[PDB]
Amino acid sequence: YPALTPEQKKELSDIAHRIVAPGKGILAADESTGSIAKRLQSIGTENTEENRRFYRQLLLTADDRVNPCIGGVILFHETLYQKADDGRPFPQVCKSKGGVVGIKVDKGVVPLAGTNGETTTQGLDGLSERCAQYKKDGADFAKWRCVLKIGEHTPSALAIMENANVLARYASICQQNGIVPIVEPEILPDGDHDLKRCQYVTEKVLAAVYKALSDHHIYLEGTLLKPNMVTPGHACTQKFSHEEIAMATVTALRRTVPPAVTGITFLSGGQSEEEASINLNAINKCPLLKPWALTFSYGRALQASALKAWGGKKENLKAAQEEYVKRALANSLACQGKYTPSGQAGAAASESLFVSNH
Amino acid sequence: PALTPEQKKELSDIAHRIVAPGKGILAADESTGSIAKRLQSIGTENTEENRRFYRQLLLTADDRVNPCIGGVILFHETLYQKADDGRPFPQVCKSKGGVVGIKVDKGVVPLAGTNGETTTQGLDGLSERCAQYKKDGADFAKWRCVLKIGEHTPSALAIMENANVLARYASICQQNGIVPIVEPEILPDGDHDLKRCQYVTEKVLAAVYKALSDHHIYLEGTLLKPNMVTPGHACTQKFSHEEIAMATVTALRRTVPPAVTGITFLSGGQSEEEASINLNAINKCPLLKPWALTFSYGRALQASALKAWGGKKENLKAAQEEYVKRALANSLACQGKYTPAGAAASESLFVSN
Amino acid sequence: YPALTPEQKKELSDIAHRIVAPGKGILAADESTGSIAKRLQSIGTENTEENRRFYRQLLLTADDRVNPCIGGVILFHETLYQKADDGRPFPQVCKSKGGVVGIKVDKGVVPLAGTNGETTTQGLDGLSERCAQYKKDGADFAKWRCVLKIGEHTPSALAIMENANVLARYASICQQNGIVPIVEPEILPDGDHDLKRCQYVTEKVLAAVYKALSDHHIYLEGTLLKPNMVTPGHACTQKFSHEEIAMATVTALRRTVPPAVTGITFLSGGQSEEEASINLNAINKCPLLKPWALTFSYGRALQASALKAWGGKKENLKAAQEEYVKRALANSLACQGKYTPSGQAGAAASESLFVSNH
Amino acid sequence: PALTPEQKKELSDIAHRIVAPGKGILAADESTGSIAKRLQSIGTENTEENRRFYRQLLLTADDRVNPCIGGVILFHETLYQKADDGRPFPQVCKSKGGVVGIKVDKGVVPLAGTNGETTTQGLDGLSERCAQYKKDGADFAKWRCVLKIGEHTPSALAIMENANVLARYASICQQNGIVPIVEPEILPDGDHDLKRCQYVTEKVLAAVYKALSDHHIYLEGTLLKPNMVTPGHACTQKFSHEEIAMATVTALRRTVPPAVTGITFLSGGQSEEEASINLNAINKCPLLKPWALTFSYGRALQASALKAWGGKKENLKAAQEEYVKRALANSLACQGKYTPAGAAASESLFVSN
């Protein structure tokens, strides 16, 4: 009793290969209303639908040097149904620039009773109809975020299992309706744990995930994974090289991610714009065999400069846009192993972008 | 700890209230699409008022029903509806000693990759919903998963995913002061015999209790709502009420911890009278049974009422006495004291899919 | 495809009901050579086969007031094939006194790699042939001991799973060959954990166990369980009532042990002879509904007085024997809720019998 | 940590030695009861010396074989036997660049309650055994589990128990410096087609790698020994070497982490020459294959040798050249360079049960 036909598997797989084609990566512009608000407050802008439309507009209409950098773009539900100044729907703006459109489908984390503050994610109710709809409207891929935490007795067995299940239900429903699912089991960087602990935990999580995906009969060639890199915790006193991070990371992946997975688009998760690209580059230079695309799905770490440059003010449109492009180019070269820093890393692009997920 | 001693005690208290001796539950929680087929069968139109009137028929029946019905399961719409005399429907229920329950699942959905098997959806925002339902009078809740015996079903994915959504559902409920009725339904569809049902029943309950343990569920503040253990609907071999009873009671002895407060069976398709008869054979089994074994019946309390009502206001009393006799027969069946039918009380209620 | 026939299930079940018939319990005389040696050294006796035969002989031939107290007796492989002074095989000595003979089949704990000193147990190789043999030779039940520890990150998921599996393989093999298995998942009392932690851990373990037994198609009515009571740890500073121990214990069992289990024969595990009987009594007096026999499978806690009285010396035969009988009578009344202490608890019967399982 | 950086490196080193480019393994580890049926087929008696002589035939073949054979799997008895010239058999092996392996399982045992399915036993005292075997020259080890495709098989219990004994086995091995070859055999018995094998193959490997993760196995210091993915022996539909290849290589892309150092296929019943041909189609698949794909063959390196030997000392050279050509053909097959049979090299080696 198969889930998918031969044609359904070719579609899903083509979609997944176009998004991580060599040199390309993912821009994640999928912050919810309550989330993007904390971004605009920090540059003194009212969080209006129109400033939301305007800022998204700024990223999706940057010049055509980004086109070979940006293979996909993840939008929030609001944005998917907004239009640029010239009247073209944002879906079509990204399509016309060579990027697959994607849509955030989860509905946020909820607490797991009887745990030390662990969560699962909700969002499956009516998901198959939402996906068919999003597909009509231009979305060819989906995103769902699960959050785990390294700490005192966490991630617990219950939270590794439950998170991995639900990422399996979500992916089954997307594939049925035409959409590549991005499976994001993010392990947070909060805490003082060292690098090898984040490797261990990540290896335990991604194995639970790819068992669950197998149990749910998910078509891996039409999926992508967006995990965290293996890093020491935010508060870890000890210091680790960028090549130590590339070794821990590639090794965690080689021990768990089956080669049929079409690619791995890392989240930046609190890394500065520059640390994200240096560590992504270091990973793509690791000489160990890596049979999947290793690129980016960066939200904060592609937009920090652009957002401080824009400041809220219409007349910085082109100066914001350019900081973003400069980043899309950095990370396209990083996702190929060709990124050598200019030595001039902007203050905004050196600022830690971490926020305790308390 | 998932819960405090005070929260745990409030759940043990409710669960015990529902399934007190000689009491069972009225499962009146038909969705608006499935109460449509019960009304279509009696020529009545599917209108908000005709559902309101039918539900008021069942809730306002006479006080003989009060010791029979510890809990009434209601659909959303009916929770916010009122009797003719102005009272909201939950206050009618409480006024007669019934605890009010709320069905909170959002139905089945296909599971890709299986032969026609499903999950159950409904978890999104369930915490806020329960919080509110508890403020509006509801103290227990209901969630149905649905498995079917076929050549390759219930599969491992099916059993494991439905036990996991049940447990999630139950965990949310209990954090909001709501007693969860856990409902893993094995449907009677197909030609399997009794042993097969028994094997599947055991296999599904073992998976259910394990999942509930993993999710830290307080079992004293749960009810279990399982199918009886019966042959398939299309089975040619036949079996006595004593065989059904033995096998149902065996299967639950081997899988259900004594801490679970009550077992409230679904009727599943059985005639009003076979459901009562079987429930009585179960309770008369000499084996030891550490939990209440009672009824949470929809069709097997409602089929004669609906026919006797006919959509006609003048039939209210007649149709209300039909409910009250099946409520009274099950009150005795769930104490082993029912020693009895009529055509409507002997008609198969089996529907497919 | 069933594992057992109707007759095979009646045999196994009858055997299991005869062993915990009201008022009866289990004497565990199944210490290995290396283990019983540490017992005899502590009364200054050479650990010879003949002193081993003699001491076992002392317990199995005590007067016939023990017969209604002792429903089964677990022997080690050596003992099963020894003979009393009058030439009668020990199996037959216990049979003639009304007790089922039982045999220890495990081969001791081994380390689980990558854990903090956790173990599983080994002993399955050739087990089905050993069981058929033991059955010919008089054994109607078997014992296998799994050990878990409460501590820093233990019992771990791996050790709960693996232990529970292997207890499932062992029980499948016993039933096939005619023998009731006693499933012993002992959680050690070592450590300073409080009572509610031992409840929690015990509830998690016994649920893993009875899932595994279900997965392996084990016939529960022809099984018994020998768990630890729920107690605070040995080093726990805090103090707990005997009724608090009976509440934690009965509650842990009601939440996990399906009613079809024929009985629960507690291990004494470091409790004094007297604490074991008071806590067993308190448990059988707990007014909560308990649908299984709640009796004893005591090794150390039936033999401490007898062994210090015997001292190694043939002429204390009858004085040793009597301390043991006095204990079998205590615990038969306890397993009925009828044990009220004499106030005169012997020093040997008040001595802690704990030994760090380091 | 299960292991130190130094222990891990010694395991990565051995695993890589075995499956170096153009090298595969000689699976010469027949138990004394199963080498009895290979000898009975050539009229030879089953005596300690006749097994010693046959094993010496295969081990002392000429140096052309040295670049083909990175590892030789031996049965206990043969590990302590000697060549005519006095050398112990492992030193013969090492002298020609072969790593010596030891089969350490104690066979299959029925799993109650299933349709004829088995586990594998052999864990008791395995740590001491390995410790000693490593002292006597062995650096890898072998353990075979056996699953069969049938209407209700491989069941969930079967898949889960055999993945768990494999992992235990592998954990013990690695604590003693021994590279474990993990062998989950899906037998070719039955009439299933290729898709079925593929589905089952994927399902079993996903369970294997999960179990290995749970038990903390260092995958760089393991080898995987899986069946190719082929139709059932009694399947009427037929399939090309390209289809077999695609499907085998797909199934392993979807389940085997790139960290596993090598995949050493079992022949499973295929003729000496079909096994070679298939291995070559696998390695020529243009898809990406992050691990070595090579051979650990018993019958598909030994069938022509045994026939040409006939039990007759004078046939030694003839029978040794038969081994050396299949060793040489597979050395090329596992590089995609085999472009070729004979009756004995084309005969089905399928046996039942």
Cα separation, C279 vs C245, whole angstroms: 7
CB contact (8 A) between residue D157 and residue C112: no
- The helix (H) or strand (E) run that includes residue D272 is helix D272-284
Cis ω before C227 (30° cut-off from 0): no
Size of interface C-D (CB pairs under 8 A): 71
Cα separation, B93 vs B83, whole angstroms: 11
* DSSP string of B282-346, one letter each residue: HHH-SS---SEEEEEESHHHHHHHHHHHTT-GGGHHHHHHHHHHHHHHHHHHTTT------SGGG
Tally of CB atoms within 10 A around D194: 20
CB contact (8 A) between residue A215 and residue B157: yes
Tell me the CA distances in angstroms from A344 to A277, A296, A321, B192, one per residue in order. 14, 22, 19, 74
Chain breaks in chain B (C to N over 2.5 A) after: 340
Q: Which residues of B are annotated as a binding site?
A: 38, 267-269, 296, 299
Distance from the D101 Cα atom to the nearest Cα atom in chain A, whole angstroms = 25
| 3-state SS assignment for residue B37 | helix
- Tell me which chain A residues have a C-beta less than 8 angstroms from the C-beta of D289: 259
Report chain C's terminal Cα–Cα distance, integer Å.
44
Cα separation, B41 vs B347, whole angstroms: 14
Residue keyed to tokens 């359904």: A8
Cα separation, B331 vs B334, whole angstroms: 6
Helix locations, chain A, DSSP H: 6-19, 33-41, 49-60, 77-80, 90-96, 127-136, 157-176, 195-215, 242-254, 273-285, 300-310, 317-334, 347-350
Residue A69's φ and ψ, nearest 5 degrees, are -95, -25
Cis ω before C155 (30° cut-off from 0): yes
Q: Catalytic residue among C226, C273, C274, C275, which?
A: C226
Cα separation, A222 vs A151, whole angstroms: 33
Amino acid type, C138 = G
Contacts of C351 (CB under 8 A, 6+ apart): C272, C304
Return the ∠ at Cα C149 (arms to C198 and A163), rounded to 5°. Answer: 80
Contacts of A202 (CB under 8 A, 6+ apart): A187, A227, A228, A230, A252
Residues making up chain C, counted from first to last: 358
Residue pair D46/D353 in contact (Cβ under 8 Å)? The answer is: no
Mutation for testing the B interface, residue in C210, C223, C264 having most B CBs under 10 Å: C210
* DSSP string of B232-295, one letter each residue: -TT-SS---HHHHHHHHHHHHHTTS-TTS-EEEEB-TT--HHHHHHHHHHHHH-SS---SEEEE
Residue pair D147/D125 in contact (Cβ under 8 Å)? The answer is: no
Nearest to D250 by CA among D203, D287, D294: D287
Cα separation, B200 vs D233, whole angstroms: 32
Instruction: Decide the pairing of beta strands B179-186 and B292-297.
Output: unpaired
Residue pair C250/C303 in contact (Cβ under 8 Å)? The answer is: no
Chains contacting D (3 or more CB pairs within 8 Å): A, C
- Would you please indicate which residues of A are annotated as catalytic (active-site) residues? 184, 226
Amino acid type, D171 = S
Return the ∠ at Cα C27 (arms to C26 and C32), rounded to 5°. Answer: 125
Residue pair A16/A221 in contact (Cβ under 8 Å)? The answer is: yes
Residue pair A56/A90 in contact (Cβ under 8 Å)? The answer is: yes
Nearest to A127 by CA among A71, A159, A70, A171: A171
Residue pair A307/A39 in contact (Cβ under 8 Å)? The answer is: yes
| DSSP 8-state assignment for residue A153 | T
Nearest to C146 by CA among C125, C171, C127: C171
Among B203, B254, B259, the residue with its CB nearest the CB of C260 is B254
Nearest to D340 by CA among D294, D295, D275, D285: D275
| 3-state SS assignment for residue A129 | helix
| 3-state SS assignment for residue D179 | strand
* DSSP string of A245-293, one letter each residue: HHHHHHHHHHTTS-TTS-EEEE--TT--HHHHHHHHHHHHH--S---SE
Tell me the CA distances in angstroms from C242 to A6, A280, B133, C247, C263, one per residue in order. 67, 61, 42, 9, 21
> Two tokens at D309?
């030997």
- Cα within 13 Å of Cα(A71), Cβ side: 23
- Tell me which chain D residues have a C-beta less than 8 angstroms from the C-beta of C157: 214
Tell me the CA distances in angstroms from B200 to A197, A347, B204, B232, D284, one per residue in order. 42, 64, 6, 12, 46
Residue keyed to tokens 């042939």: C129
D122 is in an annotated binding site: no
| 3-state SS assignment for residue B152 | coil
Contacts of B152 (CB under 8 A, 6+ apart): A1, B115
CB contact (8 A) between residue A207 and residue D203: no
Chain centre to alpha carbon of residue B166:
14
Instruction: Decide the pairing of beta strands D140-147 and D118-120.
Output: unpaired
| 3-state SS assignment for residue A29 | strand
Residues making up chain A, counted from first to last: 358
Residue pair A279/D277 in contact (Cβ under 8 Å)? The answer is: no
Examine the residue annotation and report whether C226 is marked as an active-site residue of this protein.
yes
The chain B residue lying nearest A214, using CA atoms, is B157
Contacts of B213 (CB under 8 A, 6+ apart): C203, C204, C207, C255, C256
Q: At what angle do helices A273-285 and A300-310 cross, to 10 degrees?
A: 150
Cis ω before A155 (30° cut-off from 0): yes
Report chain A's terminal Cα–Cα distance, integer Å.
44
Residue pair C222/C175 in contact (Cβ under 8 Å)? The answer is: yes
Cα separation, C329 vs C12, whole angstroms: 27
> Two tokens at A155?
């991630």
The chain B residue lying nearest A106, using CA atoms, is B124
Residue D166's φ and ψ, nearest 5 degrees, are -55, -50
Nearest to A53 by CA among A92, A95, A81, A93: A81
Residue ranges of chain A whose CB lies within 8 Å of a chain B CB: 1-4, 107, 110, 112-114, 120, 122-126, 128, 157-158, 161-162, 165, 169, 172-173, 175-176, 215-217
| DSSP 8-state assignment for residue A325 | H
Size of interface A-B (CB pairs under 8 A): 71
D299 is in an annotated binding site: yes
The chain B residue lying nearest A174, using CA atoms, is B112
- The helix (H) or strand (E) run that includes residue D18 is helix D5-18
Among B207, B213, B290, the residue with its CB nearest the CB of C291 is B290
> Two tokens at D125?
């005292």
Tally of CB atoms within 10 A around A342: 9
Residue pair B198/B235 in contact (Cβ under 8 Å)? The answer is: no
Cα separation, D67 vs D90, whole angstroms: 17
Residue pair B252/B216 in contact (Cβ under 8 Å)? The answer is: no
Distance from the A209 Cα atom to the nearest Cα atom in chain B, whole angstroms = 15
Nearest to D295 by CA among D307, D305, D308, D280: D280
Nearest to D352 by CA among D69, D84, D146: D146
Amino acid type, C212 = A
Give strand pairing partners of D74: D28, D102
- Cα within 13 Å of Cα(A277), Cβ side: 27
| DSSP 8-state assignment for residue B150 | B
> Two tokens at D353?
């049960």
Chain centre to alpha carbon of residue D119:
18
> Two tokens at A206?
């991604």
Residue pair C262/C221 in contact (Cβ under 8 Å)? The answer is: yes
Tell me the CA distances in angstroms from B137 to B28, B73, B79, one per residue in order. 16, 12, 8
Cα separation, D213 vs C158, whole angstroms: 10
Among D210, D253, D259, the residue with its CB nearest the CB of A260 is D253
Chain breaks in chain A (C to N over 2.5 A) after: none
Residue B183's φ and ψ, nearest 5 degrees, are -120, 85
Contacts of B298 (CB under 8 A, 6+ apart): B26, B27, B28, B29, B30, B266, B267
> Two tokens at D97?
């660049």
> Two tokens at C293?
């026999």
Return the ∠ at Cα A299 (arms to A293 and A300), rounded to 5°. Answer: 130
Cα separation, A113 vs A115, whole angstroms: 6
Cα separation, D204 vs D186, whole angstroms: 9
For residues A278-311, one letter each, b for 16 or more C-beta atoms within 10 angstroms of the residue's C-beta and e for the rest, the string is bbbbbbbbbeeebbbbbbbbbbbbbbbbbbbbbe
Residue pair C27/C67 in contact (Cβ under 8 Å)? The answer is: no
> Two tokens at C194?
């409080």
Residue pair D55/D81 in contact (Cβ under 8 Å)? The answer is: yes
| 3-state SS assignment for residue A71 | strand
Residue pair B291/B260 in contact (Cβ under 8 Å)? The answer is: yes
Cα separation, D281 vs C83, whole angstroms: 68
Cα separation, D162 vs D140, whole angstroms: 20
> Two tokens at C230?
């729920």
Residue pair C261/C219 in contact (Cβ under 8 Å)? The answer is: no
Give strand pairing partners of B224: B182, B263
Cα separation, D287 vs D294, whole angstroms: 16
| 3-state SS assignment for residue A343 | coil
- Cα within 13 Å of Cα(C348), Cβ side: 19
Nearest to A181 by CA among A72, A91, A284: A72
Residue pair A245/A208 in contact (Cβ under 8 Å)? The answer is: no
Instruction: Decide the pairing of beta strands A100-104 and A70-75.
Output: parallel
Among C1, C4, C158, the residue with its CB nearest the CB of D215 is C158
| 3-state SS assignment for residue D219 | helix
**SS3 of chain C:** CCCCCHHHHHHHHHHHHHHCCCCCEEEEECCCHHHHHHHHHCCCCCCCHHHHHHHHHHHHCCCCCCCCCEEEEEECHHHHCCECCCCCEHHHHHHHCCCEEEEECCCCEEECCCCCCCEEECCCCCHHHHHHHHHHCCEEEEEEEEEECCECCECCHHHHHHHHHHHHHHHHHHHHCCCEEEEEEEECCCCCCCHHHHHHHHHHHHHHHHHHHHHCCCCHHHCEECCCCCCCCCCCCCCCCHHHHHHHHHHHHHCCCCCCCCEEEECCCCCCHHHHHHHHHHHHHCCCCCCCEEEEEECHHHHHHHHHHHCCCHHHHHHHHHHHHHHHHHHHHHCCCCCCCCCCCCHHHHCCCCCCCC
Residue pair D138/D102 in contact (Cβ under 8 Å)? The answer is: yes
CB contact (8 A) between residue C122 and residue D125: yes
Cis ω before B67 (30° cut-off from 0): no
Cα separation, D208 vs D163, whole angstroms: 5
Resolution in Å equals: 1.9
Return the ∠ at Cα D147 (arms to D142 and D151), rounded to 5°. Answer: 175
Residue C75's φ and ψ, nearest 5 degrees, are -110, 160
Burial status of residue B4 (CB atoms within 10 A of its CB: 0-12, 13-18, 19 or more): exposed
Nearest to D102 by CA among D123, D63, D132, D61: D132
**So where are chain B's domains?**
1-353
Residue C261's φ and ψ, nearest 5 degrees, are -60, 130
Burial status of residue A239 (CB atoms within 10 A of its CB: 0-12, 13-18, 19 or more): exposed
Contacts of A199 (CB under 8 A, 6+ apart): A230, A248, A249, A251, A252
CB contact (8 A) between residue A162 and residue B175: no
Tally of CB atoms within 10 A around D6: 7
